[PDB]
């Protein structure tokens, strides 16, 4: 049961960039195309139903997306046999509507009859963003105004520490000492071996993973969409300089603490 990334209402449709949207919000997403009930992009004028003009979006997500130009992927054919496809896991727009492809024991599982289907993969740009949750969680978050001794006192084994780059991830691992992590695939840096115990250290672009308390290292330098993705699922304790395009808009609303 998918919910609208803007307002939280039931979302039968999705943007090309991966945001779920309700009937209303199909027409307020200027960033990229939204295929609607008639099968055409909203406001395209391909038929009577998609003739009405688009509106300008009023979510700060829409402001963030002004700096992220939509790059449309090429149409690829999804071969399906015995409920399996060669195409990677993800969400795809087809003539049967939206279709999910999930990794399983046998391979990439997809709930479609045997055949070949023209498909357009949705981008991960706005994957799992929920602005209703962001508005709630940001007010119960905290930006903490090196002072790594503070982090060691507060951090626990069940916590998760998100971090922007491979370099910042490496430096966080050295500062913590004993900690769990997965070494990023295709990295030029020399990471140490992950311990059996300790707090998890995860690369920000990997998205949200369940944890007790969550931290955002160098929050001012972090990708805006990834931050929103994180605040869609949990409150954060943000770290580093407040400022150093600019930092994400959420940090103007977020409560602060010194020391
Ligand atoms: Zn909506
Ligand atoms: Zn979009
Ligand atoms: Zn139409
Ligand atoms: Zn600001």
CSV table of C-alpha atoms and ligand atoms in Angstrom, one decimal:
chain,number,residue,atom,x,y,z
A,1,UNK,CA,0.0,0.0,0.0
A,2,UNK,CA,2.1,2.9,-1.3
A,3,UNK,CA,1.6,6.4,0.0
A,4,UNK,CA,2.2,9.8,-1.6
A,5,UNK,CA,5.6,11.2,-1.0
A,6,UNK,CA,4.2,14.7,-0.7
A,7,UNK,CA,1.0,14.3,1.3
A,8,UNK,CA,0.8,10.7,2.5
A,9,UNK,CA,-2.5,9.8,0.8
A,10,UNK,CA,-2.7,6.6,-1.3
A,11,UNK,CA,-0.4,6.7,-4.3
A,12,UNK,CA,-1.3,4.6,-7.4
A,13,UNK,CA,1.2,6.5,-9.5
A,14,UNK,CA,4.9,7.4,-9.5
A,15,UNK,CA,7.3,10.0,-10.9
A,16,UNK,CA,10.0,9.0,-13.4
A,17,UNK,CA,12.5,9.8,-10.6
A,18,UNK,CA,11.0,7.4,-8.1
A,19,UNK,CA,8.5,9.4,-6.0
A,20,UNK,CA,5.1,7.9,-5.3
A,21,UNK,CA,2.2,10.4,-5.8
A,22,UNK,CA,-1.5,10.5,-5.3
A,23,UNK,CA,-4.0,11.5,-8.0
A,24,UNK,CA,-3.7,15.2,-6.9
A,25,UNK,CA,0.1,15.4,-6.9
A,26,UNK,CA,0.5,13.8,-10.4
A,27,UNK,CA,0.1,17.4,-11.7
A,28,UNK,CA,2.5,19.2,-9.4
A,29,UNK,CA,5.8,17.6,-10.3
A,30,UNK,CA,7.6,19.8,-12.8
A,31,UNK,CA,10.9,18.0,-12.3
A,32,UNK,CA,10.1,14.9,-14.5
A,33,UNK,CA,7.2,13.1,-16.3
A,34,UNK,CA,4.4,11.4,-14.4
A,35,UNK,CA,2.5,8.7,-16.2
A,36,UNK,CA,-1.2,8.8,-15.2
A,37,UNK,CA,-4.5,6.9,-15.4
A,38,UNK,CA,-4.7,7.4,-19.2
A,39,UNK,CA,-1.2,6.0,-19.8
A,40,UNK,CA,0.3,9.3,-21.0
A,41,UNK,CA,2.4,11.8,-19.1
A,42,UNK,CA,0.3,14.4,-17.1
A,43,UNK,CA,-0.2,17.6,-19.1
A,44,UNK,CA,1.2,16.1,-22.3
A,45,UNK,CA,-2.1,16.6,-24.1
A,46,UNK,CA,-1.9,13.1,-25.6
A,47,UNK,CA,-5.6,12.6,-24.8
A,48,UNK,CA,-8.5,14.4,-23.1
A,49,UNK,CA,-7.4,13.2,-19.6
A,50,UNK,CA,-3.8,14.5,-19.8
A,51,UNK,CA,-4.8,17.9,-21.4
A,52,UNK,CA,-5.1,19.9,-18.1
A,53,UNK,CA,-1.9,21.9,-17.5
A,54,UNK,CA,0.6,21.2,-14.8
A,55,UNK,CA,0.9,23.3,-11.6
A,56,UNK,CA,4.1,24.5,-9.9
A,57,UNK,CA,5.1,22.4,-6.9
A,58,UNK,CA,5.0,24.0,-3.4
A,59,UNK,CA,7.1,21.5,-1.5
A,60,UNK,CA,10.8,22.2,-0.6
A,61,UNK,CA,11.5,18.9,-2.3
A,62,UNK,CA,10.5,20.6,-5.5
A,63,UNK,CA,13.1,23.3,-4.8
A,64,UNK,CA,15.7,20.6,-4.2
A,65,UNK,CA,14.8,19.0,-7.5
A,66,UNK,CA,15.4,22.3,-9.4
A,67,UNK,CA,19.1,21.6,-8.9
A,68,UNK,CA,18.8,17.9,-10.0
A,69,UNK,CA,18.1,17.7,-13.8
A,70,UNK,CA,16.0,14.7,-14.9
A,71,UNK,CA,18.0,12.4,-17.2
A,72,UNK,CA,15.6,10.0,-18.9
A,73,UNK,CA,16.8,6.4,-19.2
A,74,UNK,CA,16.5,4.5,-22.5
A,75,UNK,CA,13.6,2.1,-23.0
A,76,UNK,CA,14.7,-1.5,-22.3
A,77,UNK,CA,12.8,-4.7,-23.0
A,78,UNK,CA,11.9,-6.8,-20.0
A,79,UNK,CA,12.0,-10.4,-20.9
A,80,UNK,CA,9.9,-12.5,-18.5
A,81,UNK,CA,9.9,-16.3,-18.1
A,82,UNK,CA,8.6,-18.3,-15.2
A,83,UNK,CA,8.2,-15.0,-13.2
A,84,UNK,CA,11.9,-14.1,-13.7
A,85,UNK,CA,13.7,-11.4,-15.7
A,86,UNK,CA,17.3,-10.6,-16.5
A,87,UNK,CA,16.7,-6.9,-15.7
A,88,UNK,CA,18.0,-5.6,-12.3
A,89,UNK,CA,15.9,-5.2,-9.2
A,90,UNK,CA,13.9,-1.9,-9.2
A,91,UNK,CA,10.7,-0.3,-10.4
A,92,UNK,CA,9.7,-0.1,-14.0
A,93,UNK,CA,7.0,1.7,-15.9
A,94,UNK,CA,5.3,-0.6,-18.5
A,95,UNK,CA,2.1,-0.7,-20.5
A,96,UNK,CA,0.6,-2.7,-17.6
A,97,UNK,CA,1.5,0.1,-15.3
A,98,UNK,CA,4.2,0.0,-12.5
A,99,UNK,CA,6.0,-3.2,-11.9
A,100,UNK,CA,8.4,-4.2,-9.2
A,101,UNK,CA,11.4,-6.5,-9.7
A,102,UNK,CA,12.9,-8.0,-6.6
A,103,UNK,CA,15.9,-10.2,-5.9
A,104,UNK,CA,15.2,-13.8,-4.7
A,105,UNK,CA,16.6,-17.3,-4.6
A,106,UNK,CA,15.9,-18.1,-8.2
A,107,UNK,CA,16.9,-14.6,-9.4
A,108,UNK,CA,15.1,-11.3,-10.2
A,109,UNK,CA,11.5,-12.1,-9.5
A,110,UNK,CA,8.6,-10.1,-11.3
A,111,UNK,CA,4.9,-10.8,-11.1
A,112,UNK,CA,4.0,-10.8,-14.8
A,113,UNK,CA,3.0,-13.4,-17.4
A,114,UNK,CA,5.6,-14.9,-19.7
A,115,UNK,CA,6.5,-12.4,-22.4
A,116,UNK,CA,8.5,-9.4,-23.4
A,117,UNK,CA,7.6,-5.9,-22.2
A,118,UNK,CA,8.9,-2.5,-23.1
A,119,UNK,CA,10.0,-0.9,-19.8
A,120,UNK,CA,11.4,2.4,-18.4
A,121,UNK,CA,13.3,2.0,-15.1
A,122,UNK,CA,12.4,4.6,-12.5
A,123,UNK,CA,15.4,6.5,-11.2
A,124,UNK,CA,16.4,6.2,-7.5
A,125,UNK,CA,16.4,10.1,-7.2
A,126,UNK,CA,13.3,10.3,-4.9
A,127,UNK,CA,13.2,6.6,-3.8
A,128,UNK,CA,11.5,6.2,-0.4
A,129,UNK,CA,11.1,10.0,0.3
A,130,UNK,CA,8.2,10.9,2.5
A,131,UNK,CA,7.9,14.7,3.2
A,132,UNK,CA,5.2,14.2,5.8
A,133,UNK,CA,7.6,12.1,7.8
A,134,UNK,CA,10.4,14.6,7.1
A,135,UNK,CA,8.4,17.5,8.6
A,136,UNK,CA,7.7,15.5,11.7
A,137,UNK,CA,11.2,14.0,12.2
A,138,UNK,CA,13.1,17.2,11.5
A,139,UNK,CA,11.5,18.9,14.5
A,140,UNK,CA,12.5,16.0,16.8
A,141,UNK,CA,16.1,16.0,15.4
A,142,UNK,CA,19.1,17.9,16.7
A,143,UNK,CA,22.1,19.6,15.0
A,144,UNK,CA,25.1,19.5,17.3
A,145,UNK,CA,27.3,22.6,17.1
A,146,UNK,CA,37.6,18.0,16.5
A,147,UNK,CA,35.0,17.1,19.1
A,148,UNK,CA,34.9,13.3,18.3
A,149,UNK,CA,35.2,12.6,22.1
A,150,UNK,CA,31.6,13.7,22.3
A,151,UNK,CA,30.5,11.1,19.8
A,152,UNK,CA,32.3,8.3,21.6
A,153,UNK,CA,30.4,9.0,24.8
A,154,UNK,CA,27.0,9.1,23.1
A,155,UNK,CA,27.3,6.3,20.6
A,156,UNK,CA,26.1,2.8,21.3
A,157,UNK,CA,26.4,-0.6,19.6
A,158,UNK,CA,22.9,-0.5,18.1
A,159,UNK,CA,23.3,3.0,16.6
A,160,UNK,CA,24.0,3.9,13.0
A,161,UNK,CA,26.3,6.7,11.7
A,162,UNK,CA,25.7,7.9,8.2
A,163,UNK,CA,28.5,9.7,6.3
A,164,UNK,CA,28.8,11.4,2.8
A,165,UNK,CA,32.0,10.2,1.1
A,166,UNK,CA,34.4,7.2,1.2
A,167,UNK,CA,37.0,9.5,2.8
A,168,UNK,CA,34.6,10.7,5.6
A,169,UNK,CA,33.6,7.1,6.1
A,170,UNK,CA,37.2,6.0,6.5
A,171,UNK,CA,37.9,8.8,9.0
A,172,UNK,CA,34.8,7.9,11.0
A,173,UNK,CA,35.9,4.3,11.2
A,174,UNK,CA,39.4,5.3,12.5
A,175,UNK,CA,37.8,7.7,15.1
A,176,UNK,CA,35.4,5.0,16.5
A,177,UNK,CA,37.9,2.1,16.5
A,178,UNK,CA,35.7,-0.9,16.9
A,179,UNK,CA,32.8,-0.6,14.5
A,180,UNK,CA,30.8,-2.5,11.8
A,181,UNK,CA,30.6,-1.5,8.1
A,182,UNK,CA,30.6,-2.7,4.5
A,183,UNK,CA,33.5,-1.5,2.4
A,184,UNK,CA,32.1,0.5,-0.6
A,185,UNK,CA,32.3,-1.3,-3.9
A,186,UNK,CA,34.8,0.2,-6.3
A,187,UNK,CA,36.9,2.3,-3.9
A,188,UNK,CA,40.4,3.6,-4.4
A,189,UNK,CA,41.0,4.0,-0.6
A,190,UNK,CA,42.4,1.3,1.7
A,191,UNK,CA,39.8,0.5,4.3
A,192,UNK,CA,40.6,-1.6,7.4
A,193,UNK,CA,38.7,-4.7,8.3
A,194,UNK,CA,35.2,-4.3,9.9
A,195,UNK,CA,34.9,-5.6,13.5
A,196,UNK,CA,32.3,-8.1,14.8
A,197,UNK,CA,30.7,-5.6,17.2
A,198,UNK,CA,30.2,-1.8,17.5
A,199,UNK,CA,28.1,0.9,15.9
A,200,UNK,CA,27.3,0.6,12.2
A,201,UNK,CA,29.0,3.1,9.8
A,202,UNK,CA,27.1,3.3,6.5
A,203,UNK,CA,27.6,5.4,3.3
A,204,UNK,CA,24.8,7.9,3.0
A,205,UNK,CA,23.9,7.1,-0.6
A,206,UNK,CA,23.1,3.5,0.5
A,207,UNK,CA,19.9,4.8,2.2
A,208,UNK,CA,18.3,4.1,5.5
A,209,UNK,CA,18.9,1.0,7.6
A,210,UNK,CA,17.2,0.1,10.9
A,211,UNK,CA,19.0,1.3,14.0
A,212,UNK,CA,18.5,2.6,17.6
A,213,UNK,CA,19.8,6.1,17.3
A,214,UNK,CA,21.0,7.6,14.0
A,215,UNK,CA,23.8,10.1,13.3
A,216,UNK,CA,24.7,12.2,10.3
A,217,UNK,CA,28.4,13.0,10.0
A,218,UNK,CA,29.2,16.2,8.2
A,219,UNK,CA,25.5,16.9,7.7
A,220,UNK,CA,26.2,20.3,6.0
A,221,UNK,CA,28.2,18.6,3.2
A,222,UNK,CA,25.6,15.8,2.6
A,223,UNK,CA,23.4,15.3,-0.5
A,224,UNK,CA,20.0,17.0,0.0
A,225,UNK,CA,17.9,14.1,-1.4
A,226,UNK,CA,19.8,11.5,0.7
A,227,UNK,CA,19.2,13.6,3.8
A,228,UNK,CA,15.4,13.8,3.1
A,229,UNK,CA,15.5,10.0,2.4
A,230,UNK,CA,17.0,9.6,5.9
A,231,UNK,CA,14.6,11.9,7.6
A,232,UNK,CA,11.7,10.0,6.0
A,233,UNK,CA,12.5,7.0,8.2
A,234,UNK,CA,14.1,8.4,11.4
A,235,UNK,CA,15.1,11.4,13.5
A,236,UNK,CA,18.8,12.4,13.3
A,237,UNK,CA,21.6,13.8,15.4
A,238,UNK,CA,23.5,15.8,12.9
A,239,UNK,CA,27.2,16.6,13.3
A,240,UNK,CA,30.1,18.8,12.0
A,241,UNK,CA,30.0,22.5,10.8
A,242,UNK,CA,26.6,24.1,10.3
A,243,UNK,CA,27.9,25.5,7.0
A,244,UNK,CA,31.2,25.0,5.1
A,245,UNK,CA,23.9,25.6,-3.9
A,246,UNK,CA,24.3,25.3,-0.1
A,247,UNK,CA,23.4,23.0,2.8
A,248,UNK,CA,20.0,21.3,3.0
A,249,UNK,CA,17.0,23.5,3.9
A,250,UNK,CA,16.1,21.2,6.8
A,251,UNK,CA,19.0,22.5,8.9
A,252,UNK,CA,17.2,25.9,9.2
A,253,UNK,CA,14.2,24.3,10.8
A,254,UNK,CA,16.2,21.8,12.9
A,255,UNK,CA,16.7,22.4,16.7
A,256,UNK,CA,20.3,23.0,17.8
A,257,UNK,CA,22.6,22.3,20.7
A,258,UNK,CA,26.1,23.5,21.6
A,259,UNK,CA,28.9,21.6,23.3
B,1,LIG,ZN1,-0.2,13.6,-2.6
B,2,LIG,ZN1,11.0,13.8,-10.8
B,3,LIG,ZN1,-3.8,11.0,-21.8
B,4,LIG,ZN1,20.0,27.5,5.8
